[PDB]
Amino acid sequence: RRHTHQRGYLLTRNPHLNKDLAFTLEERQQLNIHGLLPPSFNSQEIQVLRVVKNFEHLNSDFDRYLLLMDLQDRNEKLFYRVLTSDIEKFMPIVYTPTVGLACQQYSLVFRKPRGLFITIHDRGHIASVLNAWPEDVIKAIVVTDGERILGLGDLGCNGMGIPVGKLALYTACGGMNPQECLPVILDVGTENEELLKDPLYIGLRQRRVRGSEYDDFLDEFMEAVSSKYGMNCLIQFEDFANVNAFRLLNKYRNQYCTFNDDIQGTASVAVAGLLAALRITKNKLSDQTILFQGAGEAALGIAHLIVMALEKEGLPKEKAIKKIWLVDSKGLIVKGRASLTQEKEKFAHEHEEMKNLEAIVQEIKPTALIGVAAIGGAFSEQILKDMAAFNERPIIFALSNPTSKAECSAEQCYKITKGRAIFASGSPFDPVTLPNGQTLYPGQGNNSYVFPGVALGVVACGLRQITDNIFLTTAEVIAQQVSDKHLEEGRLYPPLNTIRDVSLKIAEKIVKDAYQEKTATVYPEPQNKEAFVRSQMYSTDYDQILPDCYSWPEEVQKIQTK
Amino acid sequence: RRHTHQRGYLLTRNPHLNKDLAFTLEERQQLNIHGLLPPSFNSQEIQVLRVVKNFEHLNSDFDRYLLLMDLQDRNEKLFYRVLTSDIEKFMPIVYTPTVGLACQQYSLVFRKPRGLFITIHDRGHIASVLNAWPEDVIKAIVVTDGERILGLGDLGCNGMGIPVGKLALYTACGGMNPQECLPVILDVGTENEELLKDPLYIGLRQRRVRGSEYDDFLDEFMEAVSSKYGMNCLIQFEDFANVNAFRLLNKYRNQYCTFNDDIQGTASVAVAGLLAALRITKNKLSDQTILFQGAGEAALGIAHLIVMALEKEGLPKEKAIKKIWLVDSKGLIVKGRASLTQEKEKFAHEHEEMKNLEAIVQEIKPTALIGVAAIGGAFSEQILKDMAAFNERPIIFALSNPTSKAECSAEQCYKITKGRAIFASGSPFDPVTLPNGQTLYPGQGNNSYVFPGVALGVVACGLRQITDNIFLTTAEVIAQQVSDKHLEEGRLYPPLNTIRDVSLKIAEKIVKDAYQEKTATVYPEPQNKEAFVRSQMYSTDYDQILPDCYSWPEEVQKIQTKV
Amino acid sequence: RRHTHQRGYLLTRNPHLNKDLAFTLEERQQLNIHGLLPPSFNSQEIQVLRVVKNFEHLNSDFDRYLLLMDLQDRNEKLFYRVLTSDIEKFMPIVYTPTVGLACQQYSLVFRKPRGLFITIHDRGHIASVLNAWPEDVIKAIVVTDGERILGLGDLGCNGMGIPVGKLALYTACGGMNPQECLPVILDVGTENEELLKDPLYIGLRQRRVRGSEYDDFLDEFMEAVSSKYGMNCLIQFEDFANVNAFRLLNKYRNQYCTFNDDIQGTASVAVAGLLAALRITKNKLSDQTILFQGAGEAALGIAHLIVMALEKEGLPKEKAIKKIWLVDSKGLIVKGRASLTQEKEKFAHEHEEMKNLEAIVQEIKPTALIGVAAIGGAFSEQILKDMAAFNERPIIFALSNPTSKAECSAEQCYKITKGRAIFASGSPFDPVTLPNGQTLYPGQGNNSYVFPGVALGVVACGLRQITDNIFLTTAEVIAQQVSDKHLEEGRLYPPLNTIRDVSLKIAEKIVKDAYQEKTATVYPEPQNKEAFVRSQMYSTDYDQILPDCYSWPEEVQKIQTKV
């Protein structure tokens, strides 16, 4: 498969090529590294066994995170192999919630750097900074400025842990080629006083640059990235602040192959949970009344994709909007209220101002209650009783992370609703057995269901713009993977260990549709779309890097002597 | 200083050149790595402040060891800067006793390989295995076959941790250039069934090769190494089995620049402690009567070096021998006894056989009692009581490790001998306070006092052979560094935190002597030997690696054009 | 512009980066090469002054060719700067006709290899041979199997000189980036016994493989190339045998971005000359009656493209065909005759057989007489006399090469036709002066007018297919660049020294048309097509290769320390 001119000691320092003890004797000798390794030869399975044994001997998830990061920086194939050996187990270590703790400690435990750092002071030279990255083919970028790491706020340059972790799941869950992936942090300063005082802070020790200077900096970054890597290069924004998140997305989405996972990714997984839920309530989306606790990026993204799902049912915009209510820290969003943004006003219905959520549930009497504001215990005992009275099967999504910030637990919800609640969360909960002897298994509205498959699909068929329809259709694909049996068990999402298959089926729909409606740019069009996607999916198998040896007929192979 | 052609990402992957955040902006830009690092610039001391802070959050010496090995494999300069920032703290983490536990878990915790692995199956091809090592200039090699890791037994290919750890001290304590150091393991197999059934064992899964197949294999190793790196390249044996260690040493020491630390290194440090003690007993070494508990590599080496010291005073070989007595697992070593060897018989005096150590002490009535048999509490209350009766100031060396294998504690030794005992150990004991107000600070007979300075000295002056006299003279230098005050405080060795300077003064003597005795091969002869050695010592300061920029007169610098 | 990680000696060995004495002092120091070059610094024009001076001291075009190839393999920028400094002078040295003589001596004079060699014995492994080429981005390939080097025959693997030479013109005349160009030879053997007995022959010493083994081998080549470099990669066939050239073209032209220059390139340039001539005859192409001497790759290609031009005027396919007549070695091509082919029969009109060219002319009474059969003096005094009688301004193209194979000279053509003939040739003739005071400057139908501009155009807009209409439109563009003044001077083509701009205006049209007709694959669509193409054109100015240096505010640039 592969060819390389790199040899000797330096080869072992390249994590894309390094196989450690998986190198055969033949390989070692041919590559000039025989003697640099112990005289044992391991299958990949033995390599995993060793890593897992070290993994289980550690006493915290943080130490486990550090282990797996070292492994990535040493042997890329073995890293992803381990991740895919038990994806449910290793996802929450390399990504949320553990990665968040890593970001908090990032300046302290900073050792082997990952990704690319671009500062405001590199303005007018971003192109030159990109040239420090040793990979010339990039198809997927995750970028953050570190101002709103989910539930942790502004961590500045320390937020670099997020793109790295996220891309690890691009590859592990979606089969994206990691060498074609680029983590990026945009350091324009920070408003975190603790980091401004920390002598170990690895980022710019300055306040955040705002206004036009920041806007132009972002413009240059979009230009630099697309100019070098091509307009087909996917560019995903992550953990920007509310205002800049929406502003940047609307500005770039119709000229660049870009999207924001916090807004659009969360929207897709949240909607997927609803469609799956409708198969239990056996009613339609138009029969629903949706109450959001939270009116941030996720809430507005979800609500927007809910509207589009209603339009798909034929229901026009102005009527679809009226079924959706949002609440923030100042109270319910209503017409004429102070402290409102453009994106909030479009859900500001004429209604008496309200502040207390308990009262709001009792007034609105919604069918679906979706929490994303990270208010731990917001769905109090009275909330759940009320919901269980207003609806036969109340839909309760407590998507806030981590568990300490969850709106309610699974036990707490099923207990009080006496088993009739339709439940999903963002943090994981153990199954719950009821007095009737029935057991429920609430699922996780994990964003990982969405972005890997989308990114694989977009990149595979060469889609140049990512429309809201991609995410709506993606949500449908996820809901389709849920069996009626899973629903009867209380699961609203596919099992986590099937995440790679989900990602595949998501990407297939995109590719199939893209060639159908002529939005694809990759040609010639493949006969089989399913096989076409698989062909581009990263394998955890070690590639051969030895040169292809083959002979010629001796007559023309002989050395001439005259 | 140095100029490198390496650039970009691969440069950051070189631990010899990589400075991490110590790279200035200019450097990052000129080296094509700007953007690969966070936008902060740290001094070296700040980098230290980051590592130590990570270090303190760890709950075991093993995890501490792992942190430092990671650092070594990332940024060599910073590693050594951390090591030298508190040598007494970090020495027992990277080397004994922690490195021993690391060797046990080596196959489990194996990640970034260090050093060079050579196997009996590479027989006839050792020269080519050497070429896999990316440094062409080697001045110091440490080699083991893992058969007798001290106190831990046969750990086979997992013994690679020892050479690596020891060379960290060559550099940290002796200023040896780490790029010029080569850790080697010779894997001929292992008799450890525990590793032979461990699916994660990184070594050869076979029994140890013995006899002529092994002997011939070592002969090629010495040939290949001396051929490639030159005859002046220092080759130190470590943790070989008892019989092999002696056989190989006598076979190679006259032709190759080689020595065994377990034997010759331990001998030098033990003798140094005695010379120091003489300044307390205020008598000479010819007045002493030495009893050894143990008759292995260390004991016989120490015993041999005491004779040399005695010969230096004026005694012949025969008389000096009779002042030394050995005991092993089968009892006292005397003429006629069964189960004797070549070096043991050399000390087998005509005497009735004995086995009980108390009785042996009572009979011989020795001045100095030395223990190196790793038998905890061997120096009983009775033995200490007897020694304190036969002598005003009995010399007691409990050199075995770790503390659990120490012949006695400093607490029980001083107490029973009523504060009169002159005590040293291999493991570290806290100070002991006497009822008379005095506090005694028993020192530690670390091998690290010896091998770094010797290696630096031998290499700097290009000495081709390492004689016993190098070690005797080294022992003198070490004792000379102990002040009269330290002796009255009960210290037989200088403070470990001054190990750097001790290594220097050792290397100095070797160089001075070698040029005077005409045994040095490095020329021209330097005028100042002190400054000469210092110039050869590794610094933990970051080297400049940018290209030398400098202008020329504008007249001849200008671009010529059509005119 | 670009940033390279290559440094020191190896950097000087890269002809894409090496500037020789144009390296400033700063560059030399920063690139770690200071001292490897003499202490002088030259501008690019001085470097030119050195090469040309060496150039002029040579006594043969062959030695001149060698000098320039050495330069190419040393310093790519300077090579092309020299080439473009007098394109009319250097074109016939690096490409036809000198490159032909080089191909003959190629095995003898073989030194620094250029391009990529792929053999029938690499069948099944072509993809891996491709990986040996150090450039991963390829936008233009020129391939030959050496079977029919124009006028020279089967030179086998010695034909590698042609792709190499032609691509030098892609870059020099068209601004193609040479790092993105790949010369290829397909060695399937040779029928040249002279090379088969030459012990110095660098190719396979075997007979040519034919049939399905050859057909399948080409199929893999196109697959491997399109797979690795993308379907948008331009693949130009050159100097293939007659039957293969047509078969492969019709087989691949619809699926791959490919074209044959000998057929389609020559057709475009020939048609361009006719369009120019029409502005002198002041009639339309449908009024013409064309007689070809020759019925090979060039003739049939030209003939096919004339029909397309006629179809564009308003005629159907059938009527336009009857205005064209072909003659080959067996005589006139008519319905019923033996020894006909697929493309020849397409022009086989119902007519009595003929063989004598004078009689053929007398019968058909053509307006345009075109020769491409490489038969010197075929246009006899009688033929020229007849043409000047049948026509007021007879169009005479003697396109064969070299001069010794020219159907007639400009001197004898103008003279006999009494200065009324409209004349063009493939070889260059000096101006001819008429008795009426007028001097005529007969132009040259070089293929170099066509392929560079086309290739630039196709690649810049990502065109997947190359239609006949690209070549017709190109022919129009070329003729449009000839002024009325030039036509009255007797020139049917623009000055060769303006080939750069001609290639630009060709590429422009292709791009403009492709975006309008929706055949382009490069997006976003540029607003200014002219500036777009210029931005893609290779410059002979040295690129900056030093790293971008720039400071940050002192506050955040400073090294943080313990405070």
Structural features, described:
The structure is cut from a larger assembly and holds 3 copies of chain A. In chain A, 44% of the residues lie in helices and 9% in strands. Chain A is of the alpha/beta class and 562 residues long. The first copy, chain A, has 2 domains: 1-260, Rossmann fold (3-Layer(aba) Sandwich), CATH 3.40.50; 261-562, NAD(P)-binding Rossmann-like Domain (Rossmann fold). In chain A, the strands form 3 sheets. A 7-stranded mixed β-sheet of chain A has the order 8-7-6-9-10-11-14, sandwiched between helices. Chain A has a 5-stranded parallel β-sheet with strand order 1-3-2-4-5, with helices on both faces. Chain A is globular, with a radius of gyration of 25 Å. Chain A starts with 8 loop residues before the first helix and ends in a 5-residue tail after the last helix.
What is the CATH class name of the largest domain in chain A?
Alpha Beta
CATH homology group of the largest domain in chain A: NAD(P)-binding Rossmann-like Domain
Annotated CATH architecture of the largest domain in chain A: 3-Layer(aba) Sandwich
Output the number of helix runs of chain A: 25
How many strands, what sense, and barrel or not for the largest sheet of chain A? 7 strands, mixed
Q: What is the CATH topology classification name of the largest domain in chain A? A: Rossmann fold
**Structural shape of chain A:** globular
**Largest interface, C-beta within 8 A:** A-B, 52 and 52 residues
Assign the structural class of chain A, choosing from mainly alpha, mainly beta, alpha/beta, alpha+beta, or little secondary structure. alpha/beta
- What is the chains' assembly state? part of a larger assembly
Total domain count of chain A: 2
* Strand order in the sheet with the most strands of chain A: 8-7-6-9-10-11-14
State the end-to-end CA separation of chain A.
39 Å
- The fraction of residues in strands of chain A falls at 5-15%
Radius of gyration of chain A, in angstroms, nearest whole number: 25 Å
Modified residues (Phosphoserine) (chain A): 329
Subcellular location (chain A): Cytoplasm
Binding site for a divalent metal cation (chain A): 238-239, 262
GO biological process, one term (chain A): NADP metabolic process
